[model samples]
Target chain A: SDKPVAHVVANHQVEEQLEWLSQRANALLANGMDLKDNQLVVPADGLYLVYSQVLFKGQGCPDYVLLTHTVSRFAISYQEKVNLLSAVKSPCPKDTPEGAELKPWYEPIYLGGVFQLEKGDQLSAEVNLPKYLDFAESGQVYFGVIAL
Target chain B: SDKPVAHVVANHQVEEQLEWLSQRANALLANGMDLKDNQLVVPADGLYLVYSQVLFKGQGCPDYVLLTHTVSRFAISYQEKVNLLSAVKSPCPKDTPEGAELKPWYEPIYLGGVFQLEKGDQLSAEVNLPKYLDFAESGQVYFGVIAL
Candidate 1:
């Protein structure tokens, strides 16, 4: 029972790239990894579970909106970012009636799997629609990594 | 290092509940579990990661569409099913041009998390939009679990 693990909830206070709260309620960190601003730093070279969930929501749109979410890694050896898992969605229609009451819409995207990572590798969850992200609670928007 | 794990890809050939292919390409199963018709049977009791991803696509439509994806566990002790992770998405707009060519749209939903499961328990993925599911490839749709 001495394996490393960490889970971080989204910090909705930030206005830019999503940041996580590792010290708050439900946030976790262990000997296996470290938490930076928005990346989880790997402590060893091994296979681990990397995961994230992002919920996007917004009012009625006047045009199609593209939402892209990705889980990526910054390998210290490669010096370049590598995308691990990602998804894109254009969920909104551009033909809403003029003057109609804008209705709220939500789309939740979750990604998780196992991967072999190197020491010092940095894993992060990125979303293009930060403004539309739903951070109402920790469980709705979060990220985590566990050694396998 | 003798833990149990399994990963099942979507079998698009089925017309009812979502089925999985564990013996095909990219599908994986270890000593910890067994694959039945559409569920993964647990061999030992422990905390494990359960996950699933479903892609729904369709041509232009006159009515909105609702897509529901869920991962559930059938516990032997309780003799009841429990939902582990679930998501709801209504991505399409109903206002597309009537005479215009119907354009295709896609929505991918992924969910993953760790849970304490018991021996004899069964895990499965369920989706409401079977006709719109993307079974073109195993990577696009999958379900998995790993003991942690």
Candidate 2:
């Protein structure tokens, strides 16, 4: 059978969100899969959903406008298609009502790249599964948006 | 002139997401509006634009997915049409390549409330504004999202 994969479209502001989500995923893998090491290999075949939010602050208002968008979709493969470390920026608009009418103010933003891994694939500390598991087990996923 | 009025919907998750957006809004308002001496009054006959984001956390994935929705051409009113504090918990799903799916996991969740305020009305330090502003400032009526 073809290996399961996860798809992701992370915005430039997704680092914090991803860190939070990764922590949760690690916990789920530990609790749901009963993995002793608190880590699980990224599955070979399955659909994964990913997204991010960008906050925009305008004049006259003290609060920043929250503009969130999701990637069209991403298919994970054994081969790497994009760089994960490269920073993604917002491609959306900068004006509140103007950006809202034309496109999101956070546009022109790049979603994070997609990656595939086996149970023991050597991953970076940034992408490591065990560290994220530790974060998830600590109930960090609840604060995912805080990373943004 | 007649008081401007409009109706808007904000899902529970979007409300939760706004907590951060609200903080940003407050910061901008404090720094930009010069409301240090007196409370800023809400406007009466201006356009309002509202923006929202919904999060979906699936069984296999630990991180929550995000989506954006918007409403424009809102009219600000002084009288409260409905309870602004009551959470509007609703279901919002995503259309993926696999098919359309419901994010029941996020159900029964309370994100926040939606309300209406005039431009000259006094704003509470606790109230969330980014969601409301997304609708209030639609079009080129105001500066960009980061202007706040």
Candidate 3:
């Protein structure tokens, strides 16, 4: 148990590498979820439910354009960018009639499932429109994976 | 009862409370997966990657009207309904409105991560319009869980 298993949400924004997430889960901080070089390095080789939940909040229309939550893993052996999942969400109110009062909407795109990763391979998340993210230790926009 | 579990599909229609989905995966047809009346009932106390994927097929904008997939957990003994996961999708046509062409499109919304559940916690998938599901042995729309 000395080595960490996978990444855990610390409740902060996704670090520059799009790997380390700041969080208030102080307990997870002491637990075994490790962060190195701003990326969540795979601790073991097996099936993992790699996941990232990106929250997008906006008061009006402009920010609603083409928001994407993307997760990718860099595999060393193949030297490839393995695209695990991509979730796209439109902040634009759905089915709103031609003329009506539009209200602020909160959109959370959770992209994940399962993938086999090798040790030393790195994983991270990214958002095209990062400015729209509601970042903080609120545990809202978070990312990580767990051993299957 | 060797590790109780069940995976059911939407055979009939989604009711008001989003309960009662018919089963077509009768081949998987586990005694427990096909619970007396509930959807996939949990085996025991553990963490599970509760998941559902709905493949919506349509010809044009009218059929692609707002795609929604919802999951709720119910505890029988306690008589409670726990809101678990809700995922929505937009066809977001790329060349439709702009270009002079259109075709039948398939929109698949997959949602699965992890959740801690008690032994008897029940779960199921519901969509506003079941007519859109590309449902069959093709394994298009399904709801299940794996204990880890």
Candidate 4:
């Protein structure tokens, strides 16, 4: 369904990124989120409330680890070829023990933000972890863009 | 006066934008959050599905707890500002292993839902984080509005 504004796909069924298909499968599961050449292509130009949420489940988790939050845009018109619009690099807070574990539990680090997008703007999101994401039809994992 | 339709803010420790202010803080608006005069000025008022998510983290562990989540509205022409719309006692998923840690771990307290708002109505949120909360532009935490 073109119902989804724009987002990457994580199949409790399968997973990964467009450029990172080797480690993850960045397949286009929804419309408006055109996956190609390692980027999620935008269909229109405007202010977009884009978001990405992941469900993390694991076993005997470590004491601490860094869970990165990122959303980069490739809109050549605005300015920088690959402008880093929003990043948790400053990490509002340092790494905490989360994302779930097996003995281990399950935690969700759902992160996202808004961005000024253009017709040719390319966007996508990912977390730095092993095959730690879980996806399913129930909408445990999601990604998309909407006209603001 | 209410003029904003949506906005998002996430920060940790001390008080930052949006939530921490005793009054409106125009300077803390993040993303393309349409806001001013401490309230998200609504472009046009109508039935709005308003929401806010606060990511709570700390350096300790606890047992079952209840958190008050809110979405408030105010307008000059009204008799007095009131908690016109939002959520309360939303069933927390019950405490789990990952909801806490000796180090810092996190969990989200989401508040808000369907509300009938007017054009001049302003909106914001509040919470009692025993520790501290997170509000940032990273999308890890968010506050927003949508017209139905």
* Top of the candidates by lDDT: 1
RMSD of each: 5.0, 21.4, 6.9, 7.5
What ranking of all candidate models by lDDT puts the best one first?
A: 1, 3, 4, 2
User: How far out, in Å, is residue B106 in model 3?
Assistant: 4.3
Candidate 4 C-alpha lDDT tens digits along B40-144: 655565676676666554444344556555667887876866774444332223444353334444555545567777766778676654344555334445566
Q: Write the per-residue lDDT of candidate 3 for residues B7-116, one digit (tens) a residue.
A: 55655444233233434535243434445464677767655656677777776554225566767677766777754555555554222444444577777766654555
Candidate order by DockQ, decreasing, is 1, 4, 3, 2
TM-score of 3: 0.60
Best by DockQ: 1
* Model 3 per-residue lDDT tens digits across residues A1-148: 2323443443343433233543432112222345665566676677767787665655546432878888888866766666789978776745433433433445667777778777767887778877667543233455666765
Off by over 4 Å in 3: A1-42, A45-47, A53-66, A73-122, A131-144, B1-5, B12-38, B57-65, B75-79, B90-106, B129-137
Better of 1 and 4 by lDDT: 1
lDDT of 1 by residue, B15-111 (tens): 4446787766335687667988689888898999888887777767766888899999897576578889999978666665475665567789888
Q: Give stretches of model 1 more than 4 Å off.
A: A23-25, A73-84, A114-118, A134-140, B9-28, B31-41, B44-49, B62-104, B109-131, B135-140
**Reference-based lDDT, residue A139, model 3:** 34
| TM-score ranking, high to low | 1, 4, 3, 2
> Which window of 10 residues has the lowest lDDT sum in candidate 3 chain A?
A22-31
Model 2, residue A137: C-alpha shift (Å) = 17
Per-prediction DockQ comes to: 0.23, 0.02, 0.09, 0.15
> What TM-score does each model's chain B reach against the true chain B?
0.89, 0.25, 0.69, 0.60
Better of 2 and 4 by DockQ: 4
